Amino acid sequence: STQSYKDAMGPLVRECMGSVSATEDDFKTVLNRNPLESRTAQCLLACALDKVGLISPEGAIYTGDDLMPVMNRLYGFNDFKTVMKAKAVNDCANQVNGAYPDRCDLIKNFTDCVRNSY
């Protein structure tokens, strides 16, 4: 759900603008869940996902039960295709975790994987 994502992520992304040298256009890209074409937008989302509780202390994307508070915060569970979003996020996290030493690259590949998932 587009607006619910924005409601949850907006404040965090805004805070992240203070620690990531991202542009105003990057802010929109991230809030709109558009492809993270710029390295700055990739880094901006990486910061906000850490803030929202999706990234472990060691830099891994959470999976399984650990993903659920995040899915709840972002989307709630009133829509069936959050069930479907949760499965894709889990599987994509498993696919990319440990494969990208650069944290922004990790998030670029994670979000592409999620976007590509039916």
mmCIF file of N, CA, C and O in Angstrom, residues 17-109:
data_model
loop_
_atom_site.group_PDB
_atom_site.id
_atom_site.type_symbol
_atom_site.label_atom_id
_atom_site.label_comp_id
_atom_site.label_asym_id
_atom_site.label_seq_id
_atom_site.Cartn_x
_atom_site.Cartn_y
_atom_site.Cartn_z
ATOM 1 N N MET A 17 18.107 11.737 5.502
ATOM 2 C CA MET A 17 18.661 12.787 4.654
ATOM 3 C C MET A 17 19.758 13.562 5.373
ATOM 4 O O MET A 17 20.603 14.192 4.726
ATOM 5 N N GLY A 18 19.735 13.525 6.703
ATOM 6 C CA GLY A 18 20.756 14.171 7.520
ATOM 7 C C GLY A 18 22.057 13.403 7.686
ATOM 8 O O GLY A 18 23.041 13.967 8.196
ATOM 9 N N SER A 19 22.074 12.134 7.276
ATOM 10 C CA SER A 19 23.268 11.296 7.413
ATOM 11 C C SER A 19 23.657 10.645 6.095
ATOM 12 O O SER A 19 24.608 9.864 6.053
ATOM 13 N N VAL A 20 22.906 10.923 5.039
ATOM 14 C CA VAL A 20 23.234 10.388 3.698
ATOM 15 C C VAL A 20 23.150 11.562 2.736
ATOM 16 O O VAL A 20 22.159 12.277 2.757
ATOM 17 N N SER A 21 24.151 11.770 1.890
ATOM 18 C CA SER A 21 24.108 12.940 1.004
ATOM 19 C C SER A 21 23.293 12.650 -0.262
ATOM 20 O O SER A 21 23.800 12.622 -1.405
ATOM 21 N N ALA A 22 22.012 12.455 -0.020
ATOM 22 C CA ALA A 22 21.031 12.171 -1.045
ATOM 23 C C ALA A 22 20.290 13.455 -1.414
ATOM 24 O O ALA A 22 20.210 14.405 -0.622
ATOM 25 N N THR A 23 19.756 13.465 -2.623
ATOM 26 C CA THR A 23 19.025 14.632 -3.109
ATOM 27 C C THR A 23 17.544 14.551 -2.807
ATOM 28 O O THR A 23 17.015 13.494 -2.451
ATOM 29 N N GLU A 24 16.867 15.681 -3.018
ATOM 30 C CA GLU A 24 15.423 15.732 -2.908
ATOM 31 C C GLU A 24 14.775 14.756 -3.888
ATOM 32 O O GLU A 24 13.801 14.076 -3.544
ATOM 33 N N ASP A 25 15.333 14.634 -5.088
ATOM 34 C CA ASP A 25 14.781 13.645 -6.008
ATOM 35 C C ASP A 25 14.917 12.202 -5.446
ATOM 36 O O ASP A 25 14.028 11.381 -5.624
ATOM 37 N N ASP A 26 16.028 11.910 -4.765
ATOM 38 C CA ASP A 26 16.233 10.573 -4.158
ATOM 39 C C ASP A 26 15.196 10.291 -3.083
ATOM 40 O O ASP A 26 14.722 9.175 -2.938
ATOM 41 N N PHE A 27 14.872 11.316 -2.298
ATOM 42 C CA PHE A 27 13.847 11.212 -1.297
ATOM 43 C C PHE A 27 12.528 10.698 -1.920
ATOM 44 O O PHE A 27 11.923 9.771 -1.394
ATOM 45 N N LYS A 28 12.097 11.349 -3.013
ATOM 46 C CA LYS A 28 10.906 10.915 -3.758
ATOM 47 C C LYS A 28 11.054 9.487 -4.315
ATOM 48 O O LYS A 28 10.138 8.680 -4.218
ATOM 49 N N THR A 29 12.202 9.167 -4.888
ATOM 50 C CA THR A 29 12.418 7.826 -5.441
ATOM 51 C C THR A 29 12.184 6.787 -4.350
ATOM 52 O O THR A 29 11.520 5.775 -4.546
ATOM 53 N N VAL A 30 12.721 7.052 -3.164
ATOM 54 C CA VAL A 30 12.626 6.066 -2.094
ATOM 55 C C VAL A 30 11.191 6.001 -1.564
ATOM 56 O O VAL A 30 10.620 4.927 -1.405
ATOM 57 N N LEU A 31 10.570 7.155 -1.325
ATOM 58 C CA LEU A 31 9.214 7.110 -0.806
ATOM 59 C C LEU A 31 8.248 6.458 -1.781
ATOM 60 O O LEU A 31 7.304 5.811 -1.359
ATOM 61 N N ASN A 32 8.488 6.651 -3.079
ATOM 62 C CA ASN A 32 7.617 6.094 -4.109
ATOM 63 C C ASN A 32 7.916 4.615 -4.418
ATOM 64 O O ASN A 32 7.212 4.010 -5.251
ATOM 65 N N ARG A 33 8.945 4.059 -3.765
ATOM 66 C CA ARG A 33 9.435 2.687 -4.027
ATOM 67 C C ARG A 33 9.780 2.492 -5.519
ATOM 68 O O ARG A 33 9.548 1.428 -6.088
ATOM 69 N N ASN A 34 10.366 3.516 -6.122
ATOM 70 C CA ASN A 34 10.846 3.430 -7.498
ATOM 71 C C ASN A 34 12.193 2.703 -7.507
ATOM 72 O O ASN A 34 12.830 2.521 -6.460
ATOM 73 N N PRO A 35 12.590 2.196 -8.666
ATOM 74 C CA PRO A 35 13.938 1.625 -8.781
ATOM 75 C C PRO A 35 15.007 2.593 -8.275
ATOM 76 O O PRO A 35 14.992 3.779 -8.650
ATOM 77 N N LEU A 36 15.916 2.067 -7.460
ATOM 78 C CA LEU A 36 16.969 2.856 -6.819
ATOM 79 C C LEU A 36 18.133 2.979 -7.782
ATOM 80 O O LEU A 36 19.159 2.309 -7.625
ATOM 81 N N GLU A 37 17.970 3.838 -8.781
ATOM 82 C CA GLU A 37 18.965 3.935 -9.842
ATOM 83 C C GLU A 37 20.249 4.600 -9.335
ATOM 84 O O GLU A 37 21.370 4.176 -9.681
ATOM 85 N N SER A 38 20.087 5.643 -8.530
ATOM 86 C CA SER A 38 21.256 6.350 -8.011
ATOM 87 C C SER A 38 21.819 5.624 -6.805
ATOM 88 O O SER A 38 21.060 5.119 -5.960
ATOM 89 N N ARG A 39 23.152 5.571 -6.721
ATOM 90 C CA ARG A 39 23.802 5.085 -5.501
ATOM 91 C C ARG A 39 23.321 5.885 -4.279
ATOM 92 O O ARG A 39 23.111 5.318 -3.200
ATOM 93 N N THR A 40 23.151 7.201 -4.414
ATOM 94 C CA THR A 40 22.610 7.975 -3.284
ATOM 95 C C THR A 40 21.244 7.478 -2.817
ATOM 96 O O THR A 40 21.005 7.404 -1.601
ATOM 97 N N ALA A 41 20.334 7.147 -3.745
ATOM 98 C CA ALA A 41 19.022 6.645 -3.299
ATOM 99 C C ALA A 41 19.143 5.273 -2.641
ATOM 100 O O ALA A 41 18.432 4.977 -1.674
ATOM 101 N N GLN A 42 20.053 4.446 -3.162
ATOM 102 C CA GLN A 42 20.302 3.121 -2.597
ATOM 103 C C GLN A 42 20.751 3.278 -1.142
ATOM 104 O O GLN A 42 20.269 2.584 -0.240
ATOM 105 N N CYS A 43 21.696 4.183 -0.934
ATOM 106 C CA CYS A 43 22.219 4.436 0.414
ATOM 107 C C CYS A 43 21.166 5.042 1.337
ATOM 108 O O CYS A 43 21.112 4.741 2.531
ATOM 109 N N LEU A 44 20.350 5.928 0.778
ATOM 110 C CA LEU A 44 19.262 6.518 1.549
ATOM 111 C C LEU A 44 18.278 5.460 2.071
ATOM 112 O O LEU A 44 17.945 5.465 3.269
ATOM 113 N N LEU A 45 17.808 4.589 1.182
ATOM 114 C CA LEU A 45 16.933 3.491 1.612
ATOM 115 C C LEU A 45 17.631 2.570 2.617
ATOM 116 O O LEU A 45 17.019 2.161 3.596
ATOM 117 N N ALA A 46 18.913 2.260 2.385
ATOM 118 C CA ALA A 46 19.655 1.397 3.303
ATOM 119 C C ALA A 46 19.601 1.939 4.736
ATOM 120 O O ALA A 46 19.371 1.182 5.692
ATOM 121 N N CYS A 47 19.815 3.248 4.870
ATOM 122 C CA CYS A 47 19.743 3.915 6.163
ATOM 123 C C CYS A 47 18.335 3.786 6.739
ATOM 124 O O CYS A 47 18.179 3.443 7.928
ATOM 125 N N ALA A 48 17.310 4.019 5.909
ATOM 126 C CA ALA A 48 15.948 4.040 6.442
ATOM 127 C C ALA A 48 15.514 2.634 6.828
ATOM 128 O O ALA A 48 14.820 2.487 7.806
ATOM 129 N N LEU A 49 15.928 1.616 6.064
ATOM 130 C CA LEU A 49 15.595 0.225 6.399
ATOM 131 C C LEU A 49 16.268 -0.219 7.711
ATOM 132 O O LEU A 49 15.727 -1.040 8.466
ATOM 133 N N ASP A 50 17.463 0.303 7.976
ATOM 134 C CA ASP A 50 18.119 0.038 9.249
ATOM 135 C C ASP A 50 17.296 0.692 10.355
ATOM 136 O O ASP A 50 17.016 0.063 11.390
ATOM 137 N N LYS A 51 16.862 1.925 10.121
ATOM 138 C CA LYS A 51 16.034 2.614 11.130
ATOM 139 C C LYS A 51 14.693 1.941 11.426
ATOM 140 O O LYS A 51 14.187 2.002 12.570
ATOM 141 N N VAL A 52 14.095 1.344 10.406
ATOM 142 C CA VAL A 52 12.761 0.765 10.541
ATOM 143 C C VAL A 52 12.817 -0.625 11.167
ATOM 144 O O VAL A 52 11.783 -1.183 11.532
ATOM 145 N N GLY A 53 14.018 -1.182 11.287
ATOM 146 C CA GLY A 53 14.183 -2.416 12.020
ATOM 147 C C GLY A 53 14.394 -3.636 11.150
ATOM 148 O O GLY A 53 14.251 -4.764 11.651
ATOM 149 N N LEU A 54 14.755 -3.439 9.873
ATOM 150 C CA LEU A 54 14.897 -4.555 8.934
ATOM 151 C C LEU A 54 16.305 -5.148 8.841
ATOM 152 O O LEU A 54 16.500 -6.237 8.284
ATOM 153 N N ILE A 55 17.280 -4.441 9.402
ATOM 154 C CA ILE A 55 18.685 -4.828 9.271
ATOM 155 C C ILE A 55 19.292 -5.197 10.613
ATOM 156 O O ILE A 55 19.182 -4.442 11.586
ATOM 157 N N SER A 56 19.948 -6.352 10.639
ATOM 158 C CA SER A 56 20.535 -6.877 11.870
ATOM 159 C C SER A 56 21.786 -6.075 12.223
ATOM 160 O O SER A 56 22.336 -5.368 11.383
ATOM 161 N N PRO A 57 22.249 -6.174 13.471
ATOM 162 C CA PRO A 57 23.485 -5.483 13.878
ATOM 163 C C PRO A 57 24.672 -5.740 12.937
ATOM 164 O O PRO A 57 25.501 -4.837 12.719
ATOM 165 N N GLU A 58 24.720 -6.937 12.360
ATOM 166 C CA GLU A 58 25.817 -7.349 11.491
ATOM 167 C C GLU A 58 25.629 -6.937 10.027
ATOM 168 O O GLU A 58 26.511 -7.175 9.191
ATOM 169 N N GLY A 59 24.483 -6.334 9.719
ATOM 170 C CA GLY A 59 24.210 -5.852 8.376
ATOM 171 C C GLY A 59 23.396 -6.796 7.498
ATOM 172 O O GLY A 59 23.356 -6.606 6.290
ATOM 173 N N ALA A 60 22.801 -7.834 8.086
ATOM 174 C CA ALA A 60 21.944 -8.761 7.328
ATOM 175 C C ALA A 60 20.482 -8.305 7.333
ATOM 176 O O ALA A 60 19.988 -7.767 8.326
ATOM 177 N N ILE A 61 19.786 -8.544 6.227
ATOM 178 C CA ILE A 61 18.343 -8.310 6.173
ATOM 179 C C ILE A 61 17.666 -9.427 6.972
ATOM 180 O O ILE A 61 18.001 -10.605 6.793
ATOM 181 N N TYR A 62 16.770 -9.039 7.881
ATOM 182 C CA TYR A 62 16.026 -9.992 8.699
ATOM 183 C C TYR A 62 15.112 -10.845 7.847
ATOM 184 O O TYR A 62 14.577 -10.392 6.839
ATOM 185 N N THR A 63 14.930 -12.087 8.277
ATOM 186 C CA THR A 63 14.031 -13.005 7.599
ATOM 187 C C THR A 63 13.095 -13.634 8.629
ATOM 188 O O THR A 63 13.285 -13.455 9.832
ATOM 189 N N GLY A 64 12.086 -14.361 8.147
ATOM 190 C CA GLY A 64 11.234 -15.146 9.022
ATOM 191 C C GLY A 64 10.477 -14.303 10.033
ATOM 192 O O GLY A 64 9.994 -13.220 9.706
ATOM 193 N N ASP A 65 10.353 -14.797 11.269
ATOM 194 C CA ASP A 65 9.645 -14.034 12.309
ATOM 195 C C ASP A 65 10.192 -12.623 12.475
ATOM 196 O O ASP A 65 9.455 -11.696 12.845
ATOM 197 N N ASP A 66 11.488 -12.468 12.215
ATOM 198 C CA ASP A 66 12.171 -11.200 12.455
ATOM 199 C C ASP A 66 11.690 -10.109 11.496
ATOM 200 O O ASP A 66 11.836 -8.922 11.782
ATOM 201 N N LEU A 67 11.116 -10.532 10.367
ATOM 202 C CA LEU A 67 10.598 -9.660 9.322
ATOM 203 C C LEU A 67 9.220 -9.118 9.665
ATOM 204 O O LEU A 67 8.799 -8.087 9.135
ATOM 205 N N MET A 68 8.503 -9.817 10.540
ATOM 206 C CA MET A 68 7.080 -9.536 10.710
ATOM 207 C C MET A 68 6.727 -8.180 11.318
ATOM 208 O O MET A 68 5.778 -7.545 10.852
ATOM 209 N N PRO A 69 7.453 -7.705 12.337
ATOM 210 C CA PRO A 69 7.164 -6.369 12.890
ATOM 211 C C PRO A 69 7.358 -5.285 11.830
ATOM 212 O O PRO A 69 6.609 -4.300 11.799
ATOM 213 N N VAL A 70 8.336 -5.476 10.950
ATOM 214 C CA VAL A 70 8.568 -4.534 9.854
ATOM 215 C C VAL A 70 7.419 -4.554 8.840
ATOM 216 O O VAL A 70 6.860 -3.498 8.516
ATOM 217 N N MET A 71 7.046 -5.737 8.365
ATOM 218 C CA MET A 71 5.876 -5.865 7.482
ATOM 219 C C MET A 71 4.634 -5.231 8.090
ATOM 220 O O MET A 71 3.903 -4.532 7.395
ATOM 221 N N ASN A 72 4.420 -5.446 9.391
ATOM 222 C CA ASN A 72 3.297 -4.850 10.109
ATOM 223 C C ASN A 72 3.316 -3.318 10.111
ATOM 224 O O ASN A 72 2.292 -2.671 9.886
ATOM 225 N N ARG A 73 4.494 -2.761 10.377
ATOM 226 C CA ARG A 73 4.668 -1.331 10.485
ATOM 227 C C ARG A 73 4.433 -0.663 9.141
ATOM 228 O O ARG A 73 3.755 0.373 9.063
ATOM 229 N N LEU A 74 4.957 -1.293 8.090
ATOM 230 C CA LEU A 74 4.958 -0.726 6.744
ATOM 231 C C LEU A 74 3.591 -0.830 6.076
ATOM 232 O O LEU A 74 3.137 0.099 5.401
ATOM 233 N N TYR A 75 2.921 -1.955 6.294
ATOM 234 C CA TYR A 75 1.792 -2.330 5.447
ATOM 235 C C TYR A 75 0.550 -2.781 6.203
ATOM 236 O O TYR A 75 -0.565 -2.704 5.671
ATOM 237 N N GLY A 76 0.744 -3.247 7.437
ATOM 238 C CA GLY A 76 -0.303 -3.932 8.180
ATOM 239 C C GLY A 76 -0.623 -5.242 7.484
ATOM 240 O O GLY A 76 -0.082 -5.534 6.414
ATOM 241 N N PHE A 77 -1.510 -6.038 8.079
ATOM 242 C CA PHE A 77 -1.912 -7.302 7.461
ATOM 243 C C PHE A 77 -3.422 -7.338 7.260
ATOM 244 O O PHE A 77 -4.135 -8.183 7.831
ATOM 245 N N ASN A 78 -3.908 -6.389 6.463
ATOM 246 C CA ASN A 78 -5.317 -6.361 6.083
ATOM 247 C C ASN A 78 -5.482 -6.747 4.616
ATOM 248 O O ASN A 78 -6.571 -7.132 4.175
ATOM 249 N N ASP A 79 -4.383 -6.651 3.882
ATOM 250 C CA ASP A 79 -4.330 -6.923 2.452
ATOM 251 C C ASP A 79 -3.645 -8.264 2.229
ATOM 252 O O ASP A 79 -2.531 -8.477 2.721
ATOM 253 N N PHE A 80 -4.285 -9.142 1.460
ATOM 254 C CA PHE A 80 -3.689 -10.426 1.079
ATOM 255 C C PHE A 80 -2.375 -10.239 0.331
ATOM 256 O O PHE A 80 -1.469 -11.081 0.418
ATOM 257 N N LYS A 81 -2.299 -8.941 -0.478
ATOM 258 C CA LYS A 81 -1.033 -9.284 -1.147
ATOM 259 C C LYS A 81 0.143 -8.686 -0.367
ATOM 260 O O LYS A 81 1.302 -9.086 -0.551
ATOM 261 N N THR A 82 0.004 -8.362 1.099
ATOM 262 C CA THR A 82 1.086 -8.306 2.095
ATOM 263 C C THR A 82 1.608 -9.684 2.491
ATOM 264 O O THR A 82 2.784 -9.828 2.844
ATOM 265 N N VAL A 83 0.729 -10.684 2.452
ATOM 266 C CA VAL A 83 1.122 -12.071 2.662
ATOM 267 C C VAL A 83 2.160 -12.382 1.600
ATOM 268 O O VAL A 83 3.277 -12.824 1.894
ATOM 269 N N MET A 84 1.790 -12.108 0.361
ATOM 270 C CA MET A 84 2.671 -12.306 -0.782
ATOM 271 C C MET A 84 3.936 -11.427 -0.742
ATOM 272 O O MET A 84 5.001 -11.863 -1.153
ATOM 273 N N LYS A 85 3.828 -10.199 -0.251
ATOM 274 C CA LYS A 85 5.009 -9.329 -0.147
ATOM 275 C C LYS A 85 5.988 -9.926 0.872
ATOM 276 O O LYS A 85 7.202 -9.936 0.645
ATOM 277 N N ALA A 86 5.449 -10.456 1.968
ATOM 278 C CA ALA A 86 6.280 -10.984 3.048
ATOM 279 C C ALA A 86 7.115 -12.154 2.556
ATOM 280 O O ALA A 86 8.281 -12.270 2.919
ATOM 281 N N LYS A 87 6.519 -13.031 1.743
ATOM 282 C CA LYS A 87 7.239 -14.196 1.220
ATOM 283 C C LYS A 87 8.383 -13.794 0.305
ATOM 284 O O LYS A 87 9.465 -14.375 0.366
ATOM 285 N N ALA A 88 8.114 -12.824 -0.567
ATOM 286 C CA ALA A 88 9.138 -12.324 -1.488
ATOM 287 C C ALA A 88 10.298 -11.671 -0.744
ATOM 288 O O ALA A 88 11.461 -11.882 -1.109
ATOM 289 N N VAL A 89 9.981 -10.878 0.276
ATOM 290 C CA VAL A 89 10.994 -10.177 1.071
ATOM 291 C C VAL A 89 11.906 -11.210 1.742
ATOM 292 O O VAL A 89 13.146 -11.105 1.680
ATOM 293 N N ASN A 90 11.277 -12.232 2.330
ATOM 294 C CA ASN A 90 12.002 -13.341 2.948
ATOM 295 C C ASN A 90 12.953 -14.016 1.969
ATOM 296 O O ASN A 90 14.149 -14.147 2.232
ATOM 297 N N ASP A 91 12.425 -14.424 0.824
ATOM 298 C CA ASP A 91 13.217 -15.140 -0.153
ATOM 299 C C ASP A 91 14.304 -14.272 -0.764
ATOM 300 O O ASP A 91 15.401 -14.750 -1.015
ATOM 301 N N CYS A 92 14.006 -12.998 -0.977
ATOM 302 C CA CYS A 92 14.998 -12.083 -1.539
ATOM 303 C C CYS A 92 16.112 -11.791 -0.532
ATOM 304 O O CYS A 92 17.279 -11.752 -0.888
ATOM 305 N N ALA A 93 15.745 -11.647 0.737
ATOM 306 C CA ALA A 93 16.730 -11.479 1.802
ATOM 307 C C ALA A 93 17.676 -12.686 1.829
ATOM 308 O O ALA A 93 18.896 -12.525 1.886
ATOM 309 N N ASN A 94 17.113 -13.886 1.758
ATOM 310 C CA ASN A 94 17.948 -15.086 1.705
ATOM 311 C C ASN A 94 18.898 -15.148 0.513
ATOM 312 O O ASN A 94 20.031 -15.620 0.629
ATOM 313 N N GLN A 95 18.437 -14.645 -0.621
ATOM 314 C CA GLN A 95 19.197 -14.647 -1.875
ATOM 315 C C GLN A 95 20.399 -13.690 -1.867
ATOM 316 O O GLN A 95 21.490 -14.029 -2.366
ATOM 317 N N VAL A 96 20.207 -12.508 -1.289
ATOM 318 C CA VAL A 96 21.244 -11.465 -1.301
ATOM 319 C C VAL A 96 22.137 -11.405 -0.058
ATOM 320 O O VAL A 96 23.251 -10.875 -0.131
ATOM 321 N N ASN A 97 21.641 -11.881 1.081
ATOM 322 C CA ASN A 97 22.389 -11.779 2.347
ATOM 323 C C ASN A 97 23.789 -12.398 2.246
ATOM 324 O O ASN A 97 23.940 -13.541 1.798
ATOM 325 N N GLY A 98 24.801 -11.623 2.636
ATOM 326 C CA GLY A 98 26.193 -12.048 2.572
ATOM 327 C C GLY A 98 26.867 -11.949 1.212
ATOM 328 O O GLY A 98 28.060 -12.274 1.092
ATOM 329 N N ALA A 99 26.128 -11.526 0.188
ATOM 330 C CA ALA A 99 26.649 -11.501 -1.179
ATOM 331 C C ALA A 99 27.224 -10.151 -1.628
ATOM 332 O O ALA A 99 27.895 -10.080 -2.660
ATOM 333 N N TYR A 100 26.930 -9.098 -0.872
ATOM 334 C CA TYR A 100 27.308 -7.736 -1.229
ATOM 335 C C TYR A 100 27.942 -7.035 -0.034
ATOM 336 O O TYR A 100 27.229 -6.639 0.891
ATOM 337 N N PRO A 101 29.272 -6.890 -0.045
ATOM 338 C CA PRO A 101 29.977 -6.196 1.044
ATOM 339 C C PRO A 101 29.586 -4.723 1.183
ATOM 340 O O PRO A 101 29.670 -4.186 2.276
ATOM 341 N N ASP A 102 29.169 -4.085 0.097
ATOM 342 C CA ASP A 102 28.703 -2.709 0.172
ATOM 343 C C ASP A 102 27.233 -2.724 0.536
ATOM 344 O O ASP A 102 26.432 -3.335 -0.169
ATOM 345 N N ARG A 103 26.888 -2.012 1.611
ATOM 346 C CA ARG A 103 25.534 -2.016 2.159
ATOM 347 C C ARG A 103 24.530 -1.433 1.188
ATOM 348 O O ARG A 103 23.358 -1.794 1.220
ATOM 349 N N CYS A 104 24.954 -0.486 0.366
ATOM 350 C CA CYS A 104 24.011 0.139 -0.549
ATOM 351 C C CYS A 104 23.756 -0.832 -1.713
ATOM 352 O O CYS A 104 22.626 -1.014 -2.159
ATOM 353 N N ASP A 105 24.811 -1.495 -2.173
ATOM 354 C CA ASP A 105 24.654 -2.566 -3.190
ATOM 355 C C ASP A 105 23.715 -3.680 -2.709
ATOM 356 O O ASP A 105 22.946 -4.248 -3.501
ATOM 357 N N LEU A 106 23.819 -4.021 -1.430
ATOM 358 C CA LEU A 106 22.958 -5.031 -0.850
ATOM 359 C C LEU A 106 21.502 -4.638 -1.025
ATOM 360 O O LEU A 106 20.672 -5.446 -1.447
ATOM 361 N N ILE A 107 21.204 -3.384 -0.689
ATOM 362 C CA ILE A 107 19.828 -2.910 -0.772
ATOM 363 C C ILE A 107 19.370 -2.736 -2.220
ATOM 364 O O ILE A 107 18.205 -3.029 -2.555
ATOM 365 N N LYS A 108 20.278 -2.293 -3.108
ATOM 366 C CA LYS A 108 19.932 -2.241 -4.521
ATOM 367 C C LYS A 108 19.468 -3.608 -5.016
ATOM 368 O O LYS A 108 18.417 -3.718 -5.641
ATOM 369 N N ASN A 109 20.252 -4.643 -4.733
ATOM 370 C CA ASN A 109 19.932 -5.973 -5.215
ATOM 371 C C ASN A 109 18.730 -6.596 -4.534
ATOM 372 O O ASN A 109 17.929 -7.249 -5.197
#
